[PDB]
Amino acid sequence: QELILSEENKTNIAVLNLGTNDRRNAVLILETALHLVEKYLGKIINTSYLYETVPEYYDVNYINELMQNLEESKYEENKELIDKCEEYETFLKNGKVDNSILKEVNVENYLLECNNIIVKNDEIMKNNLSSYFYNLTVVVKTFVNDPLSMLVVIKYIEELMKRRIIDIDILFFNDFTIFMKNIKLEKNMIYKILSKYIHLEPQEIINNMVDNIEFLSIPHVYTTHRYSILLCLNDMIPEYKHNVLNNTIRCLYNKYVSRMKEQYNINIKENNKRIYVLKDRISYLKEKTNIVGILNVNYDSFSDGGIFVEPKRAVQRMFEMINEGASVIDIGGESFGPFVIPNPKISERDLVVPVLQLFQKEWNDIKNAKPIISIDTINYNVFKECVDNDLVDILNDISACTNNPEIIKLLKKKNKFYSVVLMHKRGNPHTMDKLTNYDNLVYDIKNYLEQRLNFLVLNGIPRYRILFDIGLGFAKKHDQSIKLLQNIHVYDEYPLFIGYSRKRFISHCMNDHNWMFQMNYMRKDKDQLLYQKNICGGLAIASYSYYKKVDLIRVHDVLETKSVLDVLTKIDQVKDPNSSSVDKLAAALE
Amino acid sequence: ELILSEENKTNIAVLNLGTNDRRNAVLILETALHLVEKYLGKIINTSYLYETVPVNYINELMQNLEESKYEENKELIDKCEEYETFLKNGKVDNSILKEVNVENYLLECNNIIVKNDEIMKNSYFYNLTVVVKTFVNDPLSMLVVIKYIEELMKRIIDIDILFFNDFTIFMKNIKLEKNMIYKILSKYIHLERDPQEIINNMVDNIEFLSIPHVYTTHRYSILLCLNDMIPEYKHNVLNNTIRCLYNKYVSRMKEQYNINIKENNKRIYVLKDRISYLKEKTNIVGILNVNFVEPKRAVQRMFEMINEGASVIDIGGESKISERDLVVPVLQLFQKEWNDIKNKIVKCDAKPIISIDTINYNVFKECVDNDLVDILNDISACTNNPEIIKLLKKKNKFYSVVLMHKRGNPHTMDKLTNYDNLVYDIKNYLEQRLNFLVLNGIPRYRILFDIGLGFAKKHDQSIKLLQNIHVYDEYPLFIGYSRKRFISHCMNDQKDQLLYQKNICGGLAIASYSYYKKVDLIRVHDVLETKSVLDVLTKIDQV
Numbered sequence A: 001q002e003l004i005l006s007e008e009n010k011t012n013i014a015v016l017n018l019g020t021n022d023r024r025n026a027v028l029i030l031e032t033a034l035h036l037v038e039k040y041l042g043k044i045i046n047t048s049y050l051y052e053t054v055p056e057y058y059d060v061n062y063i064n065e066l067m068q069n070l071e072e073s074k075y076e077e078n079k080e081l082i083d084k085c086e087e088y089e090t091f092l093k094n095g096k097v098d099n100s101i102l103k104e105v106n107v108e109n110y111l112l113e114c115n116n117i118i119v120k121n122d123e124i125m126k127n128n129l130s131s132y133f134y135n136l137t138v139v140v141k142t143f144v145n146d147p148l149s150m151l152v153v154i155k156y157i158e159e160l161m162k163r164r165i166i167d168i169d170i171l172f173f174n175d176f177t178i179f180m181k182n183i184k185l186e187k188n189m190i191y192k193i194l195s196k197y198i199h200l201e202p203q204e205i206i207n208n209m210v211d212n213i214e215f216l217s218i219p220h221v222y223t224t225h226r227y228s229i230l231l232c233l234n235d236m237i238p239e240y241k242h243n244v245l246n247n248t249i250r251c252l253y254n255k256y257v258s259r260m261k262e263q264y265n266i267n268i269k270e271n272n273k274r275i276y277v278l279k280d281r282i283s284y285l286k287e288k289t290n291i292v293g294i295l296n297v298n299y300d301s302f303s304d305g306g307i308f309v310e311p312k313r314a315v316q317r318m319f320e321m322i323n324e325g326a327s328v329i330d331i332g333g334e335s336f337g338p339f340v341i342p343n344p345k346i347s348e349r350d351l352v353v354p355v356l357q358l359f360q361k362e363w364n365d366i367k368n369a370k371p372i373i374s375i376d377t378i379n380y381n382v383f384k385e386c387v388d389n390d391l392v393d394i395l396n397d398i399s400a401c402t403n404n405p406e407i408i409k410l411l412k413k414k415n416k417f418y419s420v421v422l423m424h425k426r427g428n429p430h431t432m433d434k435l436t437n438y439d440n441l442v443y444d445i446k447n448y449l450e451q452r453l454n455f456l457v458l459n460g461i462p463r464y465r466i467l468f469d470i471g472l473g474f475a476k477k478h479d480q481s482i483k484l485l486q487n488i489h490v491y492d493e494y495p496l497f498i499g500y501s502r503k504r505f506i507s508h509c510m511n512d513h514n515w516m517f518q519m520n521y522m523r524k525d526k527d528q529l530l531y532q533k534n535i536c537g538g539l540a541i542a543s544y545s546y547y548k549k550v551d552l553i554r555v556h557d558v559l560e561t562k563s564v565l566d567v568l569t570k571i572d573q574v575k576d577p578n579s580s581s582v583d584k585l586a587a588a589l590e
Numbered sequence B: 001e002l003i004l005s006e007e008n009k010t011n012i013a014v015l016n017l018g019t020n021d022r023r024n025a026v027l028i029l030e031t032a033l034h035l036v037e038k039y040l041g042k043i044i045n046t047s048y049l050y051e052t053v054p055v056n057y058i059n060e061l062m063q064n065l066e067e068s069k070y071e072e073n074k075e076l077i078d079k080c081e082e083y084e085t086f087l088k089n090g091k092v093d094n095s096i097l098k099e100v101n102v103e104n105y106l107l108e109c110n111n112i113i114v115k116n117d118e119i120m121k122n123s124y125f126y127n128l129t130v131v132v133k134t135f136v137n138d139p140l141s142m143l144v145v146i147k148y149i150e151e152l153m154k155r156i157i158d159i160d161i162l163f164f165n166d167f168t169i170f171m172k173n174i175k176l177e178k179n180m181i182y183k184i185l186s187k188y189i190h191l192e193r194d195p196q197e198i199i200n201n202m203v204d205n206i207e208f209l210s211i212p213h214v215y216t217t218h219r220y221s222i223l224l225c226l227n228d229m230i231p232e233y234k235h236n237v238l239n240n241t242i243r244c245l246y247n248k249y250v251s252r253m254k255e256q257y258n259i260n261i262k263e264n265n266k267r268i269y270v271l272k273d274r275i276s277y278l279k280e281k282t283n284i285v286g287i288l289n290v291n292f293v294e295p296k297r298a299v300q301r302m303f304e305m306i307n308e309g310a311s312v313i314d315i316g317g318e319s320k321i322s323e324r325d326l327v328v329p330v331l332q333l334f335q336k337e338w339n340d341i342k343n344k345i346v347k348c349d350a351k352p353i354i355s356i357d358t359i360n361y362n363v364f365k366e367c368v369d370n371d372l373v374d375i376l377n378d379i380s381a382c383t384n385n386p387e388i389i390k391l392l393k394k395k396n397k398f399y400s401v402v403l404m405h406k407r408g409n410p411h412t413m414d415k416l417t418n419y420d421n422l423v424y425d426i427k428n429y430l431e432q433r434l435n436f437l438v439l440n441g442i443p444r445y446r447i448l449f450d451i452g453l454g455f456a457k458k459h460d461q462s463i464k465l466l467q468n469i470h471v472y473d474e475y476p477l478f479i480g481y482s483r484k485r486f487i488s489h490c491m492n493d494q495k496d497q498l499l500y501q502k503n504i505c506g507g508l509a510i511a512s513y514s515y516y517k518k519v520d521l522i523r524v525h526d527v528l529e530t531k532s533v534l535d536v537l538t539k540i541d542q543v
């Protein structure tokens, strides 16, 4: 109509699916699309995990330069933080929204038409008998007037991304039920829709789109039929119930899982893997316990009683940790008055940035696996300098971004996302030991972290880039740090980052030599024993963490910890999973 | 009569030994084992010790025992004909005591059973079975000797006759004339603190005789013991074999009360003189290789390891001067230093168990004669000189033994690496060695298994043995991984003291694995480091 172009200031809620077949580049492609959605469609306000899925039965330098020559949007990009989105709440509850521009169909008619598509598609795949999928859902607060307009823009975005490569579907658009059977749009109509949203500069693209939209189905035809879609939606909007559905997303999800089990004896989760991202690569949730080596610049420079920072010593230590098998380095410093009068002082920034810059330089000078760099800071300005100068990959925020929530804006650039660790604590090092009463220790901390993740996700931080840290020793008695470990299973769905290394609660476990503690100043014989015991105690927690599938463990003793993980991994590497009962029967037989 | 007939007879008896005293269970049951070896015949099978739910005079006792009239022969045996006969119900000679048939036995047993069920309306047991090749003529004579044994030791112990050959006997209203008891006893024992007043107690104590024991098939603890020793055995008076009766009793208890009767009934092994519950603690065995060197230095190292948390010390002088010269003096100095440090007498609890890593008869013999050790760690599983098995027993002492699997010697072993079914070849071998010692009278509960990591195994074979350590879930298990090459083989490449530290840490990983697999003992050089790991994992486990 003309209503499609009738420029009333609408605010709409759309749910999208983003999928690619390209394994090695799945992150780059999917995040590229995320940026294009954020630029051309509205605000990203929810995301699912990334998933590698198996079905029911390229030279990427193009992308990099594509990103520098993009047409401006006709809508303002706004990075401002939000703590709620009223239209999102309305969508979630089916609160009364404005009637659909496009004509709607009734439920029954909708169901029949979708079934027709599924049957027809099922049959074609039989004849066609002459691969991994990567999937991500997003909720978008959109300024686009209707799903046909949005699909038009989506189709434009897909074309921009071509030199399936990328597939962007619309799953929901408000509470609308729509099935438009025959769609041919003339080139000028596509132009005018595109022109309503983009400052169009270019004509090669339009042509390819003309035939590419045969029909429009909202909800997407496959919404309830493809497990991988249910799986993603279940991360984002588990309590959502659309009119066309028999139950909530969560109930539909659980029924699919349980019926796959009851009826086909298939565990559908086994072949559909949750992914998290540390830097720019896929990591499979719960498949690997990574080592994060600790670089505390204060300790490294000043614990011997010296007064100067030694950046070359610090960078050397970093190379040592890389050689010892750390996958990640966590660097931190604190503003410090190093005399007896504490007023002449060196800043956090001067502690860590020069070290990071010398590391970057020294790494570059050896092109003859770069470790992921994490920075343990709560300070906006420090993180901004690091990120602007490409010195770090991950924010490690021990306040869970409550010290300065604005730091969260630094985790998204135009063509980049950064991962973040959120830790639980109460207070600071001076007060925390007293801040120890919890109503329900395990669940208070979990609920705390979940609420922070909900806040970041609302602000367009991708769900799969957010890691949880329970903060061992930070406002927990020794027995409570243990109890948190005893109940580490409550994090089985989440990327988990823990730090037990050299903490007092380990010594609290002890009763009544090749030294693992490199002394900075001479300690008495009993303290050397205590340190050695503490480091071995933590190697015990490394083993536990291995068996509990903790994703990252943050340690001072990298060599020791890697030796433990290598042996446990080797003992787990079972060549034949049936051998043990097969060999058993054979011995009973012979 | 025909009761005291001069005929030299060889029978098979199956005994149950029971006590209520947890603190002294071992000393009491083993005292009884010794008295059974002395007064009844030869022990050729034993069960584990069990804890189930339904002292300074004893040492003195053993000094002034009256002598048996029968020989004690220690030569090793490979087989026992009469036992084979008993196991398969072959033909034996007629019972000199009158038998009853199945129906009558069952009837008379029911009567005892119900009459005892009545006597409820009107907590800890320690159990062990033994198979005895006996010179005693008949089960009634045997019961007389048994009652004597019980009086010598005295409530503190109950010794029942479970089986005696293939016989089915139910004699009621036994009255034994005071002079017959003396006469039966004198036929087996040179009768000369107790005079003849003991015989007075016994006269009332035999009221009837049931073979099989009335409760044989009715108490779980008896079935549990018998299943260890003779699972294929089927007496005429029984529905099926020991094993089936055992399995079908477990099955009843769970599908009729949701009990799972293994929660109350614990298999026990013994390292020295105390009860150890199988699979309930991972003990550390500290390694002292004397091959370090000087007595004083070596002995201070022993004290160092005790304080670091070792329950056991394993000393060896084998991987110029002799093995004997390396180890004996060290163990002598240890024993002296131990006894001096009785300034704190209260820590008589804190004496480490001592294990000697030898295959040399002469070395073990000197250790045992001088009370210098508790355990034989025989890396040949006692195949190098089986005569050493004779040293695992004294008149008032049993020693425990670790049996390890290897092939060849230190020069040849790396080449003897082919196995048809590695995990089960090694396990069956160990079971064969155990059967051999058990047949020779070594209590089953004192025998520990060791897979011999690194001895005739390639690195992947050592790992594979660890992966399948669950096959030892029923056995006391002792392993030594410490500082072995297979650990270093797991390390992913990416200087000497580097490899050394990786290896020590790689072993702490195996300590953790062993903790979770419930390995009973682990043999390590780095005692402090290992103890730290175990304390943490134990703390995590305690809710």
Ligand SMILES: Nc1ncnc2c1ncn2[C@@H]1O[C@H](COP(=O)(O)OP(=O)(O)OP(=O)(O)O)[C@@H](O)[C@H]1O
Pocket: A151, A167, A168, A169, A170, A171, A212, A213, A214, A215, A216, A217, A218, A219, A220, A221, A222
């Ligand atoms: N909600 C929707 N989102 C995206 N495409 C849709 C939707 N409803 C219908 N379509 C139609 O489906 C076709 C899109 O196919 P696409 O190229 O995305 O791969 P596909 O898997 O073959 O299709 P589909 O997205 O329907 O599964 C187009 O013709 C488009 O009009």
Ligand SMILES: Nc1ncnc2c1ncn2[C@@H]1O[C@H](COP(=O)(O)OP(=O)(O)OP(=O)(O)O)[C@@H](O)[C@H]1O
Pocket: B143, B158, B159, B160, B161, B162, B205, B206, B207, B208, B209, B210, B211, B212, B213, B214, B215
């Ligand atoms: N096979 C047997 N072994 C031991 N005692 C037996 C046997 N058959 C019958 N008895 C009789 O049972 C009594 C054994 O006394 P004991 O101290 O063992 O108490 P108990 O355990 O209650 O008896 P029982 O062992 O018969 O159940 C004696 O009177 C003994 O004659």
Ligand SMILES: Nc1nc2nccnc2c(=O)[nH]1
Pocket: A376, A396, A397, A398, A421, A422, A423, A469, A471, A472, A498, A499, A500, A554
């Ligand atoms: N995220 C995180 N950071 C830390 N920084 C210092 C000490 N412990 C920790 C810790 O346990 N977790």
Ligand SMILES: Nc1nc2nccnc2c(=O)[nH]1
Pocket: B357, B377, B378, B379, B402, B404, B450, B452, B453, B479, B480, B481, B523
């Ligand atoms: N029982 C035993 N003894 C040993 N002696 C030396 C080296 N390894 C071992 C070992 O693994 N087990």
Ligand SMILES: [Ca+2]
Pocket: A037, A038, A039, A040, A041, A042, A043, A044, A076, A077, A078
């Ligand atoms: Ca935007």
Ligand SMILES: [Ca+2]
Pocket: B036, B037, B038, B039, B040, B041, B042, B043, B071, B072, B073
């Ligand atoms: Ca004997």
Ligand SMILES: [Mg+2]
Pocket: A167, A168, A169
């Ligand atoms: Mg599609």
Ligand SMILES: [Mg+2]
Pocket: B158, B159, B160
């Ligand atoms: Mg009795």
